[PDB]
Design a protein around this nucleic acid. Structure first.
Ligand SMILES: [Mg+2]
Ligand SMILES: [Mg+2]
Ligand SMILES: [Zn+2]
Ligand SMILES: [Zn+2]
Ligand SMILES: [Zn+2]
Lengths: 171, 97, 558, 87, 112, 178, 275, 107
RNA sequence: UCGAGAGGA
DNA sequence: ACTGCTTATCGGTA
DNA sequence: TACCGATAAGCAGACGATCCTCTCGAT
């Protein structure tokens, strides 16, 4: 799933930063905003690849104000999930409704009805568990989930995945 | 004091593009509006605090841009809109010429 | 700026696309239902959810506006929608609708003339827009009936099929707001020899226009997505928000609504009559007698100064303002607000002549210099200057009216508890009074040519009057016989440079109009130079030294 | 269409700086200096940013490039150093 | 020969009272009126009925008429004219605005 | 405000396309054959959990080299702690997403040592399958041909059941030790 | 109407006069490409005068006792006499000068020599005589090969259009023509020594000064031109006192402009001239 | 070329567009009595081939339409008998340049 | 603010 | 204030 | 006689210095 995307970003720079340490500041201003940021269109922008050779080209100094509009052409790693993509992560949150699974930067929730009927929640256990026989889902326990649906929400993509199907479940 | 047609024409002749732009904007009208990239219409609901920028009927919260135009041009485009005419403000080039 | 920062990106408008509003998109774009034709009051107060602020543009002091708030100065207003009981024609596209009706044949909705006709191919040859349609109209205008089989000399003798039902298209004329058709037939059958007359309602026209083929749009100069011929007939009308038709503040409790607010309510009134008339016991010729009125209101709303016959009066017996007449040329929106407008940082006073002034110099009265301001940004190059100035306040000569912080806040030095204080941080703006040698634009109406609009060096002088050098009288063509003149102070370092590098008076000495200079020595200067330049007169030592000292760039050598 | 322009080799435009270029380069540099931009020329106690902007043009220490657009959309990028200041 | 005759007639009026206006000025107008194929009237239905962008032509006489035909014939104003830029409150591509000015990183470090 | 790379054409509203699914109906941006900053038509770069791990590590190791250049004028659990230190140097603590990503990537990586992953990519990026399928096969551990065909439904008829098993068995040998 | 008709019109970076749309109105502004302010009405000495005086003032004949240059004018005046190599260049000089007379007469039929052109040569030689304090007593430092070649070498550097191809190179040659015609009129080898009396120092300076003033005289891409023209014709139109032997009554003043701009099926005075 | 003395019936003008690529033209006796090109005001009009035309639009960066236009029924256009697309280089005496080269495309 | 009327270079 | 654009009667083409 | 362009006999929709300053009356 993890894609490499060579997308760009327009950055308007104030005239006071038109000093020799401009390239370094503009490259940092790119990481400051883009690196860590998440969008519905591209997903989680994880890491801006190759700090050396980032195209800055020329920044047009705006009409009535002295600021320069620098288009910063870059390449980065993105985490954009899909509805049907099978991913195996680690359970973090667990309650009567279900359990949340941390797959990379994204948290995938699994409902009580999206998991097998012959499982059921166990409140009288610390940390909260999902037993059946020798298979128990707790605070850690790595599982394999099939993303049933994707949700955009702010700058953080979330998903409602299932584990009730063949070759899925606990790993 | 009115900077009429004759006044504008004289400034064009001089070639002073920034002064003419300053007198028509900064010295008078000048209004910031958020426009839908998809349509080109001022149909964007620009919430500056909650950031719910989406244009109803377009569903987008992404392809939205802010523009500096004279408030009278905004009113002109709205008057045209009120007359079933669409003056779609496009921020992208598509004909070269 | 329209005040405050926005996380959205600012971009230059590269092109503006034109078209027609699809009644489908108007309904999507809308935020208001507009059921009630009443403006203010619930009936109580603060405008009902019918006409004005149901979920659109705010009113007096309240920000409200569809949860987004923002307030009057930021709220661009949000369009509503009024569903029309029966479809109606758009005033502008009246003749266009008639010409398309005379082009594409009825009952089938297909072109009268096809590619089979040699002249139609010659007409379709130009990939224009309107000039292609000009030929398409004249060709389809005649040839009254629709066809089925037509080619006889490109195919042996037999004619092959190409079109649908071969019904006769009628001759169409204008009976005011409506168009009527005259069917022929009469060949030894019905109606003896006199033609058949029918009233062509929008509902009929719209159906034919909806069945018009995709390639019949392009042939007639119409767009597949921007200008569909159907959209020339309004089924849903957009209602403009208050910034378009402002309510106005008439004391604590009254009204004083815009002409457009009353006109839109007049459309709703006529729409609501039809709304019930169509639903309830339909008295045939009673709906049409109110439909022609709804057609009339929706017409005068966009264009009141309509062709010859109709006219609308608002009561008192004076007409109503139309959107066409609002943005109509000559001091109306386009020519009065956009191509020329009233501007801030400007002055006007009676002009006088001066021999002791420099050519490019201007005499600015203190009461103008003190009133007009230039925003000078705080840098290490000024500070102490701008600081001494801030301390002088809005009443002393160097002074300053406002001080702009790092954040968007003006410090009116007239008032303010920190007026005497103010540390003055860097990058801050100081709205300082105009000082000497400040490049400022000067002008005299009518501004007929390149000059009569020249950049001048300021010289703050006493007495409420604009002082000018006599030699620059000619470019402005101004005598001092009670003549008034304008002035414009630039607000940027760039715009003030754009004047001092191009619009400067000494720069504009040689006229590119006649190839000769435009300034010369006139009146006393010219009359005196004759009396001086001659062998007859000489000047003795006492007057000779004062003469030499008066020259500013004198070498000091007698 | 797909990334136009003209190389810094073979250019049909005037090697001399247009009076409009000078006015813009001077005006913008002055605006930038006014907006606290770092100055490249050795200041001679100059309080006015335009006096500095003019001094910046004398030594040709302005790091500005002019994109001269042709009517077909193609452009020639001329650095203020290349442009000779006669006028 | 029609433009040559047009210039002669145009100039003869400037020459009639108060000499003169430089050739280039009239030769421009004359060439404008003729580099169309024939004679182009300096009226509402002469020059104003041209291939030019909607907003430019709407600012001279035929306003709401041109704006309606712009929407009806789905016109697209290229935003290359003086008038459209003034209406849009943007820097017109006239003289000072006829070019873009950028800053060079290669140059900036070179000067220090 | 980073919306770029594969832009145009938008002609009024649009249908939105189709829902993003495992039928290789990927985002209108993630086309199998996309563009480049140079201009060429470059194939979609999809990384598996092993590739992506040694891609961010490579970029960040080479980031610190350049970050400290301007300042002038390999064991399971030990990989976790070393990367944690690197993330504090190269990037700020604000980027919590990259910290969650790196922690996940290093614990779920099928191939740790660079040498093996090179052969994994030479084995997978030769099968004649969509880059996403390759990125999924190299990320998800599969024992059965049916296991892979069920977890990656994009396959099914795309590859032979027996021939897919040859690849799946080859990966088990290529597997690193944790 | 004039100013609205010529808004869009501007001189482009490719020395062409186009508009908003991009249609070419003029290929070179005012057909010569000179910024209207840098122009002065200069008289062409080649067109005006008798054929006898023209031969007298311009023809240099080293192969003659009376039609040669006296060694009181040239430093090498006796050793230049009868030279076949040097007289070929002076035949080449006079043959272009005789073509100049025939070509100028084709353009300016009425005989008028006083025409508005850039670079005031009348003053540039006046300036040289004072800047270098040149005396009529001593002969020039210049040679025939220094003068005639130096003038033709100057003509090469007088640039309007920057080219590479046949069209722009021919457009450049067309753009100058009339100006370099005046240059041959004023910088003719004979005239240089007989009237001006220039030294090698002053002549090399004048060649550079003409080159400099010309490159300054060219139109700036960005000049409004159209608005400039529209205002420049509309401005005198305001001060037109008389609204109309020649005939007795014709149509002139402001009402004639009405006709010319309206275009124009009005009678008034449609009086034609037969020769 | 076909020369008539009075009037060609519009029916004898109907079979004229037929038979390509043969270009058939009509000229009246009275129209041809005096040469229009020989007139004082009329300048030199020179036809340009597809080889010549393509070089002009390429070097002057023109897009065919942008070029000044000449009427099809123009006296000098019919004199050279050119069709839509054919460009003519107009050489005229310029009272500022000496001589100026203009260009006009046929309609 | 609308509309009329008046007044000025 | 100008010259225009849209439409009733009418001789001749084959 | 089935057609095909002629020159009239009529009608119509939009305009006309740029700025400036003052006063009086609602329906
Ligand atoms: Mg257009
Ligand atoms: Mg006066
Ligand atoms: Zn939209
Ligand atoms: Zn709002
Ligand atoms: Zn039909």
């Amino acid at each position: 799933m993890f894609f490499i995307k060579d997308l760009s970003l327009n950055i308007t720079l104030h005239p006071s930063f038109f000093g020799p340490r401009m390239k370094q500041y503009l490259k940092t201003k790119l990481l400051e905003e883009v690196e860590g940021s998440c969008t519905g269109k591209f997903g989680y922008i994880l890491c801006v690849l190759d700090y050396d050779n980032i195209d800055i080209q020329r920044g047009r100094i705006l009409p009535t104000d002295g600021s320069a509009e620098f288009n910063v052409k870059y390449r980065a790693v993105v985490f954009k999930p899909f509805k049907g993509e099978v991913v195996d992560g680690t359970v973090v949150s667990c309650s009567q409704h279900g359990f949340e699974v941390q797959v990379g930067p994204m948290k995938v929730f699994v409902t009580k009805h999206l998991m097998p009927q012959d499982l059921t929640f166990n409140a009288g256990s610390n940390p909260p568990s999902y037993q059946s026989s020798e298979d128990v889902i707790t605070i850690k326990s790595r599982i394999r989930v099939k993303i049933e649906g994707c949700i955009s929400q702010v700058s953080s993509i979330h998903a409602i995945g299932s584990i009730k199907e063949d070759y899925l479940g606990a790993i | 004091l009115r900077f009429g047609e004759m006044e504008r024409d004289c400034m064009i002749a001089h070639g002073a593009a920034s002064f003419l732009k300053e007198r028509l904007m900064e010295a008078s009208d000048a209004f910031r509006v958020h426009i839908c990239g998809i349509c080109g219409l001022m149909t964007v609901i620009a919430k500056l605090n909650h950031n719910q920028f989406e244009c109803k009927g377009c569903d987008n919260k992404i392809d939205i841009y802010q523009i500096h135009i004279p408030y009278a041009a905004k009113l002109l485009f709205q008057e045209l809109m009120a007359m079933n005419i669409t003056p779609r403000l496009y921020t992208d080039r598509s004909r070269d010429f | 700026v329209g005040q405050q920062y926005s996380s959205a990106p600012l971009r230059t408008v590269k092109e503006v696309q034109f078209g027609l509003f699809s009644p489908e998109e108007v309904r999507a774009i809308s935020v208001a239902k507009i059921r009630f034709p009443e403006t203010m009051d619930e009936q109580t107060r603060a405008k009902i959810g019918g006409l004005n602020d149901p979920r659109l543009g705010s009113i007096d002091r309240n920000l409200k506006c569809q949860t987004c708030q923002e307030g009057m100065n930021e709220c661009p207003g949000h369009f509503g929608h009024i569903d029309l009981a029966k479809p109606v024609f758009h005033v502008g596209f009246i003749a266009k609708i008639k010409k398309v009706c005379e082009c594409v044949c009825m009952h089938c909705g297909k072109l009268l003339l096809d590619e089979h006709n040699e002249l139609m191919r010659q007409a379709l040859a130009i990939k224009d827009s309107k000039k292609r349609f000009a030929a398409i109209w004249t060709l389809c205008k005649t040839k009254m009936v629709c066809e089925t089989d037509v080619p006889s000399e490109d195919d042996p003798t037999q004619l092959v099929s190409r079109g649908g039902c071969g019904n006769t298209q009628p001759t169409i004329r204008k009976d005011g707001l409506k168009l009527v058709g005259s069917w022929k037939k009469d060949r030894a059958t019905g109606d003896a020899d006199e033609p058949e007359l029918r009233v062509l309602s929008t509902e009929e026209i719209l159906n034919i226009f909806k069945h018009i083929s995709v390639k019949d749009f392009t042939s007639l100069g119409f767009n597949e997505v921007f200008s569909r011929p159907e959209w020339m007939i309004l089924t849903c009308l957009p209602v403009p928000p208050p910034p378009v038709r402002p309510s106005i503040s008439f004391n604590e409790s009254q009204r004083g609504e815009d002409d457009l607010t009353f006109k839109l309510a007049d459309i709703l009134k006529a729409n609501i009559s039809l709304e019930t008339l169509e639903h309830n016991g339909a008295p045939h010729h009673a709906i049409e007698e109110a439909e022609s009125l709804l057609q009339f209101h929706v017409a005068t709303y966009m264009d009141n100064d309509i062709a010859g016959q109709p006219q609308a009066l608002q009561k008192s017996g004076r007409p109503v303002k139309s959107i066409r007449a609002r943005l109509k040329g000559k001091e109306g929106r386009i020519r009065g607000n956009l191509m020329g407008k009233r501007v801030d940082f400007s002055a006007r006073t009676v002009i006088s002549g001066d021999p002791n002034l420099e050519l490019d110099q201007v005499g600015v009265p203190k009461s103008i210099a003190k009133t007009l301001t230039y925003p000078e940004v705080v840098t290490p190059y000024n500070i102490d200057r701008l600081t001494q100035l801030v301390r002088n306040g809005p009443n002393e000569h160097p002074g300053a009216k406002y001080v702009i912080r790092d954040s968007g806040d003006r410090i009116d030095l007239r008032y303010s508890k920190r007026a005497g204080d103010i540390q003055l941080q860097y990058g801050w703006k100081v709205e300082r009074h105009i000082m000497d040698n400040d490049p400022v634009l000067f002008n005299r109406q009518p501004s007929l040519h390149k000059m009569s609009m020249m950049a001048h060096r300021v010289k703050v002088i006493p007495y409420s009057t604009f002082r000018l050098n006599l030699s620059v009288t000619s470019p402005y063509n101004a005598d001092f016989d009670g003549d008034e003149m304008n002035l414009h102070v630039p607000q940027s370092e760039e715009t003030r440079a754009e004047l001092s590098q191009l619009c400067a008076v000494p720069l504009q000495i040689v006229s590119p109009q006649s190839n000769k200079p435009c300034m010369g020595i006139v009146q006393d200067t010219l009359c005196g130079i004759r009396k001086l330049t001659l062998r007859d007169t000489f000047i003795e030592l006492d007057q000779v030294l004062n003469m030499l000292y008066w020259v500013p760039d004198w070498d000091g050598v007698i | 269409l797909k990334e136009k322009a003209i190389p810094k080799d073979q250019r049909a435009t005037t090697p001399y700086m247009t009076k409009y270029e000078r006015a813009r380069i001077l005006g913008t540099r002055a605006l930038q200096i006014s907006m606290n931009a770092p100055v490249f020329v050795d200041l001679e106690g100059e309080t006015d940013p335009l006096r500095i902007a003019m001094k910046e043009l004398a030594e040709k220490k302005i790091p500005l490039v002019i994109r001269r657009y042709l009517p077909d959309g193609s452009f020639e990028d001329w650095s203020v150093e290349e442009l000779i200041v006669d006028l | 020969a029609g433009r040559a005759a047009l210039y002669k007639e145009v100039y003869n009026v400037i020459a009639s009272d108060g000499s003169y206006v430089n050739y280039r000025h009239m030769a421009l107008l004359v060439d404008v009126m003729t580099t169309q194929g024939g004679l182009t009237s300096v009226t509402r239905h002469g020059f104003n009925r041209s291939n030019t962008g909607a907003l430019m032509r709407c600012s001279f006489e035929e306003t709401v008429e041109i704006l309606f035909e712009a929407g009806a014939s789905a016109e697209l104003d290229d935003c290359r004219g003086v008038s459209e830029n003034v209406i849009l409150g943007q820097m017109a591509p006239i003289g000072t605005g006829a070019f873009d000015v950028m800053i060079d990183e290669e140059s900036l470090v070179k000067y220090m | 405000s980073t919306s770029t790379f594969q832009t145009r054409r938008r002609r009024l509203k649009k249908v939105e396309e189709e829902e993003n699914a495992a039928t290789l109906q990927l985002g209108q941006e993630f086309q199998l054959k996309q563009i480049n900053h140079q201009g060429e038509e470059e194939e979609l770069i999809a990384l598996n959990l092993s590739e992506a791990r040694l891609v961010i590590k490579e970029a960040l190791v080479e980031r610190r080299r350049a970050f400290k250049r301007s300042q002038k004028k390999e064991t399971r659990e030990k990989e976790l702690e070393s990367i944690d230190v690197l993330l504090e140097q190269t990037t700020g603590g604000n980027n919590k997403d990259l910290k969650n990503t790196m922690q996940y990537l290093t614990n779920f990586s099928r191939f740790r040592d660079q040498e093996t992953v090179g052969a994994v990519i030479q084995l997978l990026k030769s099968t004649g399958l969509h880059p996403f399928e390759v990125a999924q096969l190299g990320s998800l551990a599969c024992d059965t041909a049916d296991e892979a065909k069920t977890l990656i439904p994009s396959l099914n008829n795309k590859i032979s059941d027996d021939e897919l098993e040859r690849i799946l068995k080859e990966l088990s040998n290529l597997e690193t030790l944790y | 109407r004039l100013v609205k008709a010529l808004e869009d019109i501007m001189v482009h970076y490719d020395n062409t006069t186009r508009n908003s749309l991009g249609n070419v109105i003029q290929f070179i502004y005012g057909e010569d490409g000179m910024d209207a302010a840098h122009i002065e009405k200069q008289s062409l000495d080649t067109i005006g005068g008798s054929d006898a005086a023209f031969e007298k003032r311009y023809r240099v004949d080293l192969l003659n006792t009376d039609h040669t240059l006296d060694p009181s004018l040239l430093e090498s005046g006796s050793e230049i006499l009868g030279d076949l190599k040097l007289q070929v260049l002076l035949d080449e000089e006079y043959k272009q000068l005789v073509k100049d007379r025939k070509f100028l007469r084709e353009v300016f039929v009425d005989g008028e020599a006083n025409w508005p052109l850039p670079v005031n040569i009348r003053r540039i030689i006046q300036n040289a005589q004072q800047t270098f304090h040149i005396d009529h007593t001593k002969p020039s430092d210049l040679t025939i090969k220094d003068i005639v070649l130096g003038v033709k070498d100057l003509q090469e550097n007088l640039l309007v259009l920057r080219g590479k191809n046949e069209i722009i190179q021919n457009a450049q040659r067309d753009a100058v023509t009339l100006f370099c015609c005046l240059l041959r009129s004023r910088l003719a080898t004979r005239r240089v020594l007989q009237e001006y009396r220039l030294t090698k120092q002053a002549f090399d300076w004048v060649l550079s000064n003409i080159e400099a003033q010309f490159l300054r005289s060219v139109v700036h891409p960005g000049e409004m031109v159209g608005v400039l023209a529209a205002q420049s014709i509309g401005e005198p139109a305001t001060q037109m006192t008389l609204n109309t032997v020649a005939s007795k009554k014709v149509t002139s003043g402001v009402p004639r402009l009405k006709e010319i701009l309206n275009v124009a099926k009005n009678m008034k005075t449609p009086s034609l001239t037969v020769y | 070329i076909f020369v008539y003395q009075n009037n060609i019936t519009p029916s004898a003008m109907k079979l004229v567009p037929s038979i390509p690529p043969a270009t058939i033209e009509t000229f009246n006796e009275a129209a041809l009595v005096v040469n229009i090109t020989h007139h004082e005001l009329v300048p030199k009009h020179i036809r340009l081939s597809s080889d010549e035309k393509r070089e002009l639009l390429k070097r002057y960066r023109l897009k065919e339409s942008q070029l000044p236009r000449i009427q099809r029924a123009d006296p000098v256009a019919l004199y050279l008998g050119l069709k839509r697309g054919e460009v003519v280089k107009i050489i005229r005496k310029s009272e500022t340049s000496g001589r100026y080269a203009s260009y006009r495309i046929c309609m």
